Structure formats: C-alpha cells, structure tokens
Design an enzyme around this catalytic site. Structure first.
Site, PDB file in Angstrom:
ATOM      1  N   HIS A  68       0.869  -1.219   0.000  1.00  0.00           N
ATOM      2  CA  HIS A  68       0.000   0.000   0.000  1.00  0.00           C
ATOM      3  C   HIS A  68       0.885   1.242   0.000  1.00  0.00           C
ATOM      4  O   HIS A  68       0.849   2.034   0.933  1.00  0.00           O
ATOM      5  CB  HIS A  68      -0.985  -0.011   1.165  1.00  0.00           C
ATOM      6  CG  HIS A  68      -2.159  -0.888   0.899  1.00  0.00           C
ATOM      7  ND1 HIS A  68      -2.290  -2.112   1.488  1.00  0.00           N
ATOM      8  CD2 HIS A  68      -3.174  -0.782   0.014  1.00  0.00           C
ATOM      9  CE1 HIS A  68      -3.367  -2.719   1.021  1.00  0.00           C
ATOM     10  NE2 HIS A  68      -3.925  -1.935   0.111  1.00  0.00           N
ATOM     11  N   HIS A 106      -5.837   7.554  -3.370  1.00  0.00           N
ATOM     12  CA  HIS A 106      -6.876   6.662  -2.792  1.00  0.00           C
ATOM     13  C   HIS A 106      -6.334   5.892  -1.591  1.00  0.00           C
ATOM     14  O   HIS A 106      -7.164   5.442  -0.818  1.00  0.00           O
ATOM     15  CB  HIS A 106      -7.469   5.719  -3.853  1.00  0.00           C
ATOM     16  CG  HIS A 106      -6.684   4.463  -4.044  1.00  0.00           C
ATOM     17  ND1 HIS A 106      -5.523   4.446  -4.744  1.00  0.00           N
ATOM     18  CD2 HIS A 106      -6.831   3.222  -3.536  1.00  0.00           C
ATOM     19  CE1 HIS A 106      -4.991   3.237  -4.699  1.00  0.00           C
ATOM     20  NE2 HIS A 106      -5.769   2.459  -3.973  1.00  0.00           N
ATOM     21  N   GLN A 269      -6.038 -16.884  -2.811  1.00  0.00           N
ATOM     22  CA  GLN A 269      -6.051 -16.144  -4.101  1.00  0.00           C
ATOM     23  C   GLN A 269      -7.182 -16.634  -5.026  1.00  0.00           C
ATOM     24  O   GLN A 269      -7.843 -15.771  -5.616  1.00  0.00           O
ATOM     25  CB  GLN A 269      -4.715 -16.285  -4.827  1.00  0.00           C
ATOM     26  CG  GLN A 269      -3.613 -15.401  -4.306  1.00  0.00           C
ATOM     27  CD  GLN A 269      -3.968 -13.934  -4.381  1.00  0.00           C
ATOM     28  OE1 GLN A 269      -3.567 -13.226  -5.301  1.00  0.00           O
ATOM     29  NE2 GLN A 269      -4.737 -13.463  -3.409  1.00  0.00           N
TER      30      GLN A 269
HETATM   31  C1  LIG Z   1      -9.154  -7.795   1.098  1.00  0.00           C
HETATM   32  O1  LIG Z   1      -8.757  -9.231   1.041  1.00  0.00           O
HETATM   33  C2  LIG Z   1      -7.941  -9.595   0.020  1.00  0.00           C
HETATM   34  C3  LIG Z   1      -7.663 -10.966  -0.077  1.00  0.00           C
HETATM   35  C4  LIG Z   1      -6.785 -11.325  -1.088  1.00  0.00           C
HETATM   36  C5  LIG Z   1      -6.286 -10.371  -1.994  1.00  0.00           C
HETATM   37  N1  LIG Z   1      -5.453 -10.735  -3.050  1.00  0.00           N
HETATM   38  C6  LIG Z   1      -5.115  -9.824  -4.062  1.00  0.00           C
HETATM   39  O2  LIG Z   1      -4.603 -10.229  -5.122  1.00  0.00           O
HETATM   40  C7  LIG Z   1      -5.471  -8.439  -3.834  1.00  0.00           C
HETATM   41  C8  LIG Z   1      -5.287  -7.289  -4.601  1.00  0.00           C
HETATM   42  C9  LIG Z   1      -4.606  -7.179  -5.905  1.00  0.00           C
HETATM   43  N2  LIG Z   1      -5.829  -6.209  -3.919  1.00  0.00           N
HETATM   44  C10 LIG Z   1      -6.360  -6.663  -2.776  1.00  0.00           C
HETATM   45  C11 LIG Z   1      -6.995  -5.763  -1.807  1.00  0.00           C
HETATM   46  C12 LIG Z   1      -8.214  -5.194  -2.122  1.00  0.00           C
HETATM   47  C13 LIG Z   1      -8.768  -4.353  -1.169  1.00  0.00           C
HETATM   48  C14 LIG Z   1      -8.125  -3.983   0.017  1.00  0.00           C
HETATM   49  C15 LIG Z   1      -6.888  -4.543   0.352  1.00  0.00           C
HETATM   50  C16 LIG Z   1      -6.340  -5.404  -0.596  1.00  0.00           C
HETATM   51 CL1  LIG Z   1      -4.824  -6.066  -0.262  1.00  0.00          CL
HETATM   52  N3  LIG Z   1      -6.179  -8.034  -2.685  1.00  0.00           N
HETATM   53  C17 LIG Z   1      -6.637  -9.018  -1.793  1.00  0.00           C
HETATM   54  N4  LIG Z   1      -7.453  -8.630  -0.809  1.00  0.00           N
HETATM   55 MG   LIG Z   2      -7.383   1.369   0.101  1.00  0.00          MG
HETATM   56 ZN   LIG Z   3      -5.515   0.612  -3.087  1.00  0.00          ZN
END
Ligand SMILES: COc1ccc2[nH]c(=O)c3c(C)nc(-c4ccccc4Cl)n3c2n1
Ligand SMILES: [Mg+2]
Ligand SMILES: [Zn+2]
EC number: 3.1.4.17
Length: 313
Positions: A68, A106, A269
């Site tokens: 992030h 964001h 995943q």
């Molecule tokens: C919120 O729970 C998850 C679970 C698995 C993933 N795996 C990904 O590939 C992923 C990606 C590309 N972005 C997010 C994500 C989306 C919203 C908030 C936080 C994350 Cl890490 N995730 C994930 N977010």
């Molecule tokens: Mg966010």
């Molecule tokens: Zn983001």
C-alpha cells in the site's frame, strides 16, 4: 505551455496497454503520471508547477509498506488512465481530472492494516470514522494536501466545478472500500440485466465510477503472470504483519493472514479471484466493453493460480 513529457519508445507504447508495469525506477513515476494526465486531460488541465508540488507531497505521505505504497498509487492511476483512454467520449472533463487524482490519492498514509484491525486495536481513526475508516482518512489527507500553499491544482475551476470535482474524488476514494463493492456491483448487475442502467443518471454514474475504482485498485490481478505473482508476495507480506498484530491482541487470524499457514495462499487467491476479481471485471466489461482485456488477463491469472495448487508451479 509547450513543455510535453515524453517517454522512451518501449514505455510510450506499453503505457497504452492495461497490463503495463511502471517498472522499478521510482524517479520515473511522477513523469509517467504527468504523461498520463496530459494525454487523458490535456496539457492545460493543471499548472505544471502546482501539479509537480502536489505529486511530490502525495508521494511523501505514502509510507514505506510492502504493498500500500507509492508504487500502488501510480499503478492504480495507470489502470484508470487505460480505462479512460479506451472510453474517450463517455467521461466529462471534470471526471478525467478527478479520477486520475483520486487513484493517485486513494491509499494516502496507509499503514498496511485493514479497517478490521483498526477497529480491534481501537485506533483513534476507528472512533473518528466508524465505516470506511482508512478511506475517510485517505480522502481527508487528500483535502489536506490540496490546501497546502501552491498545491491547489483545481484553483482555476469555478466554485461549482471545484465542489463537483472534490465530490467526484470523495465518492471515488470511498468506493475503494471493498465492503462497499459487493452491493455496488450487484446493483449494477441488476440495472444492466433489466436494461435500466442510464449513464445520464448521476446516481448510476456514481456507481459505475465506483466499480472502475474497484477495478483499478485490484489491477495487480490483471498483469502478466510474473508481475501478478511477485505483487502477491507484497500483498501477503502486509497480511502476515496484520496477522502477527492480531495474535498480539490475543486474536487467532484467518489462515490467509497467518504466516504459519502459507500453503493456504494459492486457495486464498482463487477465492479472491472467484469472489471479488472475476465478478468485478465481468460487470465492468458488460458496462464498458473496451475494458475486456482486464477480464481476460484476470481469467489467465486465475488459471495460473489453479496451476500453482495442482503442483505444476
Ligand atoms: C481484502 O482481502 C484480500 C484478499 C486477497 C487479496 N489478493 C489480491 O490479489 C489483492 C489485490 C490485488 N488487492 C487486494 C486488496 C483489495 C482491497 C483492500 C486490500 C487489498 Cl490487499 N487483494 C486481496 N485482498
Ligand atoms: Mg485502500
Ligand atoms: Zn488501493
């Protein structure tokens, strides 16, 4: 006015594709973003001096967390750029201005922890913002940076254009809260299927911009397999830190977030592709047909993660 940003030839051509990776050279990222603004919006949209000061203040308020981070911010902006460029006539001038800035801002000041961990820790932000906790904070930080002297990139809008664009940015950033995505997408699914979707209805536009935001934010899942796989290590590095902090509060984390249960990643995943990504890019492809390469890339990577489970890699 006549000062254009240009890219090397390979970058100039690949930046136009959804699966573009911004690369490992951090100091090229501001210039890739301005490049994207000038082609998406125009060379007049922003005073370049202001825009540069804004970008460099945004960069400094991203933390050094595995996922992030500043690279995520720019990557999410680039997905929005590819969406806007393949849908030239569907978006207003204010929307193109707003959406590229919302993507870049964001995840401002993200510490690499979920809204759930903030609530369980009892973090001050959780009492300040009961829902979309981090996202009301990302919008707050964005407004703060805009109000630093010489940073207001929107100063040449009218009062009402200004209020419209901060309202586009606030909704766009709130929409990145994945707890809101499920209901937003179901609603869009219903409106599309019953053919009541109406892009001249503001409430409907808001929902479609919301889905575009989710789609941009998840765009790591749409990259060439080696990018998507290496990004998933940064994603899980944050989840395992959070899991460690849950265990310090006397809370056993879900196995996905437990750094003793790494075996359970591939299936975590798959669940994420099937429960979140595939449906997201499917509904998006239905409303915005030129975003179809995102759904195809996402299906390719779902299939690569299936291979990982079957032991083939
Ligand atoms: C919120 O729970 C998850 C679970 C698995 C993933 N795996 C990904 O590939 C992923 C990606 C590309 N972005 C997010 C994500 C989306 C919203 C908030 C936080 C994350 Cl890490 N995730 C994930 N977010
Ligand atoms: Mg966010
Ligand atoms: Zn983001």
């Amino acid at each position: 006015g006549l000062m254009q940003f240009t890219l090397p030839v390979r970058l100039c051509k690949e930046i136009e594709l959804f699966h573009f990776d911004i690369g490992p050279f951090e100091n090229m990222w501001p210039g890739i973003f301005v490049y994207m603004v000038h082609r998406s919006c125009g060379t007049s949209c922003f005073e370049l001096e202001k825009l540069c000061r804004f970008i460099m203040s945004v960069k400094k308020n991203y933390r050094r967390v595995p996922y992030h981070n500043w690279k995520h911010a720019v990557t999410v902006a680039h997905c929005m750029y590819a969406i806007l460029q393949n849908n030239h006539t569907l978006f207003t001038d204010l929307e193109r201005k707003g959406l590229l800035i919302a993507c870049l801002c964001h995840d401002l000041d993200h510490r690499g922890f979920s809204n759930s961990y903030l609530q369980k820790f009892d973090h001050p932000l959780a009492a300040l913002y009961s829902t979309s906790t981090m996202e009301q904070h990302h919008f707050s930080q964005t407004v703060s940076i805009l109000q630093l002297e010489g940073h207001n990139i929107f100063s040449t809008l009218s009062s009402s254009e200004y209020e419209q664009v901060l309202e586009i940015i606030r909704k766009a950033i709130i929409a990145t809260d994945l707890a809101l995505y499920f209901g937003n997408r179901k609603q869009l699914e219903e409106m599309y299927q019953t053919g009541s979707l109406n892009l001249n209805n503001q409430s409907h536009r808001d929902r479609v911009i919301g889905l575009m935001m989710t789609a941009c934010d998840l765009c790591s899942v749409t990259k060439l397999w080696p990018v998507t796989k290496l990004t998933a290590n940064d994603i899980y590095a944050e989840f395992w830190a959070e899991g460690d902090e849950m265990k310090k509060l006397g809370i056993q984390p879900i196995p996905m977030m437990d750094r003793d249960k790494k075996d359970e990643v591939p299936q975590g995943q798959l669940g994420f592709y099937n429960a979140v990504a595939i449906p997201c890019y499917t509904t998006l492809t239905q409303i915005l047909p030129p975003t179809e390469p995102l759904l195809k890339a996402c299906r390719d990577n779902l299939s690569q993660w299936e291979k990982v489970i079957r032991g083939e890699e």
